[PDB]
Each structure stands twice: as C-alpha cells, then as structure tokens.
C-alpha cells in the first residue's frame, strides 16, 4: 500500500490523461513510468541496449521527469498525453529536489506492485532498488530550476543519474557547471541538422531555441562528465545532411554519439530500418575524424559512434562504460 503525495499543478483533465497513460504524478510537477522496456525484461530476461552500450542495467532504472508537461518544443516524435505541451517554463510553485526524489522512488515501487507470477523474482527484488535515475520522461527536464541539486539528491541515495535533454537551455548547464553538479551521463537529443528542419520537426515554442542548442553543445565541450549526442532518425523527416549533424556534434565532442530509429502526423514508415541506421552511421562517421563506429543494438535500430579516446574497456569518464 504505497501512497504517493501530490497534486498536479495542471488542469484535472490532462493530469487524468496521463493517469491513463500509467504515469505516478509527483507533488506538483513531476512523474514516474515503467520503462516501456522494463516489462519483457522482468518476464521475459529481456536486455536493453543501454546495457549492451554502457552496462546499464535497464530494470534497475527509475525513468523519471521534474518537468511533466512542459516542454520548448512540440516535437512531432513526441510522445504527450495531451494535444500541445501547457508552456514554455515550469510554473510555481516549484517541489524540492529531495521531496522529488523520495516521492518517485515510492512512486516507483506503487507501479511495480502491479506486478508481484511469469515475473523473475531477484529481478523484481532489483528493480525495487533502482540505482539508474533516468531522467528523461517527457517534458524538458532542465526547465527545472534545481536539477543541479536533484542530481545531488540521487546520488546521496546512492543513484548514478542520466539526464536527456534537448538542449534548448544552456543557463541550467551553465548553472550545474559553476556549482559542480553534474549528473554521470549527459545526453543533448539533436533531431536537425538544419534551421527548417529544426522548425518541421521540432515545432519550436521559443524564438532562439536552435543558438540555445548552439550554446549547450559548446558548453558540452571538455564537460568533465560522460557525454552524448543523441541522434533520433525519422524516414524522410531529418536522415539527411549527415556532414551538418557532424558539426554539431564537434562543437560538444561528446565521448559517444548514438544514431537512433525513431519507433499524429507520423506514419509507421517514418521509422527507419536498423539497415538504414547502419547506413546513416557510416555516412555520418565518415565526417568525425577521431571517432568510430563501436557497437550496435538491431532491436532497437541503433549504432554506437565513440571518440577514439575512449577505451573500449574502461569505465568512467574515459572508458565506454559506467563505473560497475
């Protein structure tokens, strides 16, 4: 009987819609899910490919967001409970980082309760001890003020954190930076290459969001953090201009670059094949002098590109893999 507080700072109707999607609201403007991953993994020993890239163990994963329903863009990829996105900032008042993390993680447990039968039990047993916290539900994360010290507050507890962002907030970077709080693995999400794809794709609610991007990548260069430039492909939407999406990724020099298949205006075959990826891949590496083609994950449609500096089998900030 696990009681999570809040009370969803939204209008009732759209915190009701994503009560039917399963998310847990959290306080005012947080939520939990099960990883859509998560499932088959309890029931069926199935793998994820952040395990394979970074021996991340996926079903010990709390996936989380301290920004649930706002967000700077209305991406066509995007997956929302609700028509648009409610704005471009987190409205007041705003929940502290340790009463957001203790409430998730009892959020965590109240959906995991949904399960106990055809259920592996020291896995079960694991994954009620997260030790991942993925932050990046929906919504933009780093429109919360205080990401810094919710990065903290994970670790306190003992949770190595995973930040997803879209980049369009460079002060909150900027923030963690100067107060040292960085997360264990930084990923900025680039789905254009281009201004107009930037504009189609992204669906832009701010007016200078892709200099903001501009910023965040050169804020990422020499990040005393793991690093990654996430690539989400969607067929004959934004796999083109490989060489432009490989200057992007040079402003950051991110540790790693992964090449990913996108899976309401998009059909289903928007969605590239993991052969297509593949293709993108090598496209695209050869416009990255110093980094190379690591590893692959077909089920998930996604290539692994790593800076030669990197070992192969290292962990850390150095290594291709997170500290065991």
């Known amino acids: 009987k696990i009681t999570v507080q809040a009370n969803p700072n939204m209008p009732k109707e759209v915190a009701e819609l994503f009560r039917k999607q399963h ?17 088959k ?18 079903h010990r994963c709390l996936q989380m967001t301290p ?7 209305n991406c066509i990829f995007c997956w929302r409970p609700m028509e648009n996105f409610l704005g471009t900032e987190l409205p007041q008042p705003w929940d502290d980082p340790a009463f957001i993390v203790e409430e998730s993680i009892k959020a965590q447990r109240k959906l ?25 539900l929906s919504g933009e994360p780093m429109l919360y003020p205080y990401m810094g010290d919710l990065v903290e507050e994970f670790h306190k507890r003992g949770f190595t954190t ?19 709080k960085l997360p264990t693995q930084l990923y900025v999400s680039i789905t254009a290459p281009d201004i107009e794809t930037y504009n189609s794709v992204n669906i832009p609610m701010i007016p200078d969001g892709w200099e903001r991007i501009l910023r965040f990548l050169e804020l990422m260069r020499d990040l005393p953090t793991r690093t990654v430039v996430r690539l989400t492909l969607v067929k004959g939407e934004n ?21 990913k298949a996108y899976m309401n205006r998009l059909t289903i075959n928007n969605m590239p094949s993991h052969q297509d990826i593949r293709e993108f891949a090598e496209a695209l590496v050869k416009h990255l002098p110093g980094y190379h083609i690591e590893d692959e994950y077909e089920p998930s ?20 893999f997170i500290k065991h």
């Open 112 to 136: 995991l309760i949904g399960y106990k039968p055809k259920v592996d039990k020291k896995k079960f047993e694991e994954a009620w001890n997260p030790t991942h916290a993925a932050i990046s």
């Open 162 to 180: 995973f930040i997803v962002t879209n980049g369009t907030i460079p002060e909150r970077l900027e923030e963690m930076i100067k107060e040292d």
């Open 23 to 39: 998310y847990e609201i959290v306080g005012r403007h947080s939520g939990v899910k099960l990883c859509h991953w998560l499932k």
């Open 301 to 320: 449609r996604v290539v692994l590109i790593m800076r030669d500096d990197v070992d192969p089998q290292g962990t850390g900030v150095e290594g291709r």
């Open 67 to 73: 920004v649930l329903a706002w967000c700077t863009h």
């Open 239 to 259: 796999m083109h201009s490989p060489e432009k999406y490989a200057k992007l990724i040079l402003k950051a020099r991110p540790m790693f670059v992964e090449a």
């Open 41 to 58: 993994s309890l029931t069926e020993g199935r793998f994820c490919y952040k395990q394979k890239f970074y021996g991340i163990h996926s």
